Design a protein around this ligand. Structure first.
Ligand SMILES: CN[C@@H]1[C@@H](O)[C@@H](O[C@@H]2[C@@H](O)[C@H](O[C@H]3O[C@H]([C@@H](C)O)[C@@H](O)[C@H](O)[C@H]3N)[C@@H](N)C[C@H]2N)OC[C@]1(C)O
Lengths: 63, 386, 108, 172
RNA sequence: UAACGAGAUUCCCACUGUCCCUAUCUACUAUCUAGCGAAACCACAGCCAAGGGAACGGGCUUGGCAGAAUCAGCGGGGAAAG
RNA sequence: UGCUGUAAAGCUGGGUCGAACGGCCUCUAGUGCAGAUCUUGGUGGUAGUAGCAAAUAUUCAAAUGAGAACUUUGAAGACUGA
RNA sequence: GCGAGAGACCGAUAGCGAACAAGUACAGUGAUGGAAAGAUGAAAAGAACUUUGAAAAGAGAGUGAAAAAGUACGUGAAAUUGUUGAAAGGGAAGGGCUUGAGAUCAGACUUGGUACCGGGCCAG
């Protein structure tokens, strides 16, 4: 119910900013149990945590 | 020391205090002085301000540069359905002023005037005047004794009358009830005329004729709290004035050590009671006339209402009075029309006006057509017309 | 009285947002829709679907559409000691034009 | 503990207290006076309507330069206000006193608020910073609240005696 | 004395709400509410006119008068505060 | 609650309270407060008043919880703009 | 400095600055500057248990000679404040003098003497 640490750990493990980390809204309890980086990796592999895609910056008008 | 230079006072000391009027309906302070030898008549009439328009006229003032020439003039429309007489009041002279002796009411009161006696009509049992009505049903002898009292003792007789507000487009359902003084004839004649008009309608054309000069009593447009610059027209202080410039810089000398009543101060502006005189009647139109807005020279089959309706009022579907110029009040405001308090013999008072044309283009914008038919003729067929 | 009922409405948000501070237009549209749902369903307990919130904010803080087609349903609220026996659920309606649409009872 | 007022019949009464409550003394005094001497149930209903801004608390002493409202017409005033925190503290104390009365067997619908008062509690100090490097006080003005619920010769001269004897002998 | 100057000054062109003469609009305040909550200052206090008086009184003398509780403003007075 | 004295003051009834204290003859002094912009501490009126307005901006739902404008998660709208 | 005995001395704003974890806490770059603060009760017997409350707490109960001693603790003044009762109130209030009204207080049937004697007070 306070997933601030899990968000920070996922950002570190996945290799993105915190702004690109998606924590499953429907899986709050299991994410709350993920205290180690190892558990964060497991949740990342299962898809419970997801890397959001980058916001497009197209160069088509520039070209 | 004296003022370095002279200037007239800002604002008039005769319209004080600049406070909110006590009632929204404007009251008639004074009625025309009674002349016994005239026919019995009403001296006032209540209507509703509908809006303004433009007319064209030929001027008849010899010696004027515009003599025998067309002039364009602003004019005001007052929606004036007939009033209903519902009662009579007798006043006796006393060394302390006029005192009302008794009030006599008609047998039946319409729902719109009986709504006037209620703050919460929908939650009430509607008992107003229900026991009074039984003073007629038995034999009306008590009513006639009261009227005999008025004949014996009163020196001033006024009728109680109300507007038929449901003939206007107003969403207000309460009628406006007022005392209108009866002038002419003896007191007995006044009481008889009041009695024969109980429950009856009296029309505007019986009080006011065309070319008459009449007075308007109404409460002005409200503006709320106002500063001295606009409330009193004082000079704006220079641009570089610390703490602001819409002020009166000196509000008094050291002595007297009190702010004087004559100094301009910030306060409530507008919503004042005003009695404006000498507004000429340009037309007394009729509600049944389907060419209210037509003249001898402009023969178009046309009502007084502008295309689209009067803005924020509606359509004038009753008898109306077209008055020269502007009158106090806003749209929808109940206005009291009064006969002149004096005899006027000047040209402007005795001129007979003959209207050439009355404008009926939209008041909601830059109206450029007088009629839907003219609009269609100018623009031709449109897509929505197929 | 049909306590449980679903109807579809048009709300004229343009006249309700007239003169409103530009950074409060979308937040005030939220408040206007809540007030609109109480005027028709008689319930102060009004819940807005998050898809409605997305539709309100689609064009930014001052980009609210002039008219929105809403589906409002009054529903029971067991939730004892709630002060409200019913509540109104407000959700958007995808339509090609939000013009010329009358209030319609929805047969679920 | 000693209450400022002791019930006439303690068997038909129930009290409650709150000390050192961090709620405005002035708002609490006005809210306590607004229900002083009322039936308990009437007072609870009224406080709930105050919280909903349907009725207001009349401010009669601590009211200088507060606003004016039409909800004061009920009480003959123009200055009234809706202090939620004071209302909540007073409601909690009324609830506690009702619980105490129920434990003593008293009937809730008969209970009237026969005593209620607010006293100053010691102030809590904070600090506020002023222009030109000055420090001023920023204190709280807390409250002591307490309340109680309660179930609802002519001897005569010689001449006077002689006069009455004579008058009695006259009328039989 | 060319050049230079946030230096002082006069006139001209352009320009304009500086002005004639003001009006209207926006945001934030003020305003009302929930919560929070200071300070300056304070003999006692607080309606006027005249008198006399430390020769310009809130109080004293003689008059005018005088009706609870108040809110937003205001800058005459408190020979206001610092 | 009263009594005595012109007075400075003295005595007494009732309540509160818990460990020492007074009359008389004398001795002695760091011995009597309204003021000193007195000292230290405490407390008011002011006053629920001034005010809590720079730095574009927040919204819906769920979770948690006695309690959520302010916590967490999701959706979104924004900004810093290397 | 070390060891003793005393006083017509002071009695917690006094007496050393300090009666207490006082040259402490804290301030200042530094030299230096430098407070406030003693007392439940004989004994913690420091309130078990029930109940309302999210809780702090309340209400019962309990201990105690006392809770009018509850670690906000000996007594517990004043300013200031709440409630209750009584009264007054047209641009201050307060004071003297006088009386009325309402409240309080007091006294001679005496330390009365033996139905009588005799006295006290207010009056004609
Ligand atoms: C727990 N708070 C402590 C508290 O112990 C406080 O003690 C006072 C204490 O000194 C008082 O006691 C006092 O007793 C007398 C007399 C005036 O009562 C004083 O002369 C004496 O200095 C003092 N002991 C006592 N009556 C109340 C406690 N709060 O001392 C300071 C403090 C921080 O407030």
């Amino acid at each position: 119910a306070n997933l601030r640490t899990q968000k920070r750990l996922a950002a570190s493990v996945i290799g993105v900013g915190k702004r690109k980390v998606w924590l499953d809204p429907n899986e709050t309890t299991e994410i709350a149990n993920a205290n180690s980086r190892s558990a964060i990796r497991k949740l990342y592999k299962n898809g419970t945590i997801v890397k959001k895609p980058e916001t497009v910056h197209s160069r088509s008008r520039a070209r | 020391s004296h003022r370095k230079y002279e200037a007239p006072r800002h604002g008039s000391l005769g319209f004080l205090p600049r406070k909110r009027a006590a009632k929204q309906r404007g009251r008639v302070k004074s009625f025309p002085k009674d002349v016994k030898s005239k026919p019995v008549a009403l001296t006032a009439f209540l209507g509703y301000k509908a809006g303004m328009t433009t007319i064209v006229r030929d001027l008849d003032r010899p010696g004027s540069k515009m003599h025998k020439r067309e002039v364009v003039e602003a004019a005001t429309v007052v929606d004036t359905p007939p009033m209903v007489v519902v009662g009579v009041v007798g006043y006796v002279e006393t060394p302390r002023g006029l005192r009302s002796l008794t009030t006599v009411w008609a047998e039946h009161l319409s729902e719109e005037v009986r709504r006037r006696f209620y703050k919460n009509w929908y939650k009430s049992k509607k008992k107003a005047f229900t026991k009074y009505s039984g003073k007629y049903a038995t034999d009306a002898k008590q009513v006639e004794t009261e009227l005999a009292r008025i004949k014996k003792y009163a020196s001033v007789v006024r009728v109680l009358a109300h507007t038929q507000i449901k003939k206007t487009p107003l969403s207000q359902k309460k009628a406006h009830l007022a005392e209108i003084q009866i002038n002419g004839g003896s007191v007995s004649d006044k009481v008889d005329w009041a009695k024969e008009h109980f429950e009856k309608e009296v029309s505007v054309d019986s009080v006011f004729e065309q070319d008459e000069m009449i007075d308007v009593i109404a409460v002005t447009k409200g503006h709320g709290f106002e500063g001295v610059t606009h409330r009193w027209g004082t000079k704006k202080l220079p641009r570089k004035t610390h703490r602001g410039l819409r002020k009166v810089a000196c509000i008094g000398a050291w002595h007297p050590a009190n702010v004087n009543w004559t100094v301009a101060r910030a306060g409530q502006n507008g919503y004042h009671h005003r009695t404006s005189i000498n507004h000429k009647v340009y037309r007394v139109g009729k509600g049944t006339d389907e060419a209210n807005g037509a003249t001898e020279f402009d023969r178009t089959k046309k009502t007084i209402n502008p295309m689209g309706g009067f803005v924020r009022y509606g359509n004038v579907n009753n008898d109306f009075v077209l008055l020269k110029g502007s009158i106090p009040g806003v749209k929808k405001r109940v206005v009291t029309l009064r006969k002149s308090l004096y005899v006027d013999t000047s040209r402007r008072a005795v001129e007979k006006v003959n209207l050439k044309w009355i404008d009926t283009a939209s008041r909601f914008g830059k109206g450029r057509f007088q009629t839907p038919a003219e609009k269609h003729a100018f623009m031709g067929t449109l897509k929505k017309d197929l | 009285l049909q306590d449980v009922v679903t109807r579809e409405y048009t709300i004229n948000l343009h006249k309700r947002l007239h003169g409103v501070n530009f950074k409060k237009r979308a937040p005030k549209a939220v408040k206007e829709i809540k007030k609109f749902a109480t005027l028709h369903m008689g319930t102060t307990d009004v819940r807005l679907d998050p898809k409605l919130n997305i539709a309100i904010w689609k064009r930014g803080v001052q980009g609210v559409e002039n008219r929105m087609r809403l589906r409002i349903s009054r529903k029971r609220n067991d939730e004892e000691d709630a002060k409200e026996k019913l509540f109104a659920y407000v959700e958007p309606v995808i339509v090609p034009s939000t013009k010329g649409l009358q209030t319609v009872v929805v047969e679920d | 503990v000693r209450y400022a007022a002791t019930p006439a019949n303690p068997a038909k009464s129930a009290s409650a207290r709150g000390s050192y409550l961090r709620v405005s003394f002035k708002n609490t005094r006005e809210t306590a006076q607004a229900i002083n001497g009322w039936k308990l149930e009437k007072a609870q209903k009224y406080l709930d309507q105050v919280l909903d801004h349907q009725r207001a608390i009349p401010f009669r002493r601590y009211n200088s330069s507060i606003g004016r409202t039409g909800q004061g017409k009920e009480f003959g005033v123009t200055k009234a206000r809706w202090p939620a925190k004071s209302v909540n503290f007073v409601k909690d104390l009324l609830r506690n006193a009702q619980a105490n009365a129920e434990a003593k067997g008293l009937d809730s619908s008969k209970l009237v608020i026969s005593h209620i008062q607010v006293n100053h509690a010691p102030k809590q100090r904070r600090r506020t910073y002023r222009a030109h490097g000055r420090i001023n006080a920023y204190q709280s003005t807390p409250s002591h609240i307490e309340l109680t619920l309660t179930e609802e010769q002519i001897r005569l001269n010689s001449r006077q005696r002689g006069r009455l004897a004579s008058q009695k002998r006259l009328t039989a």
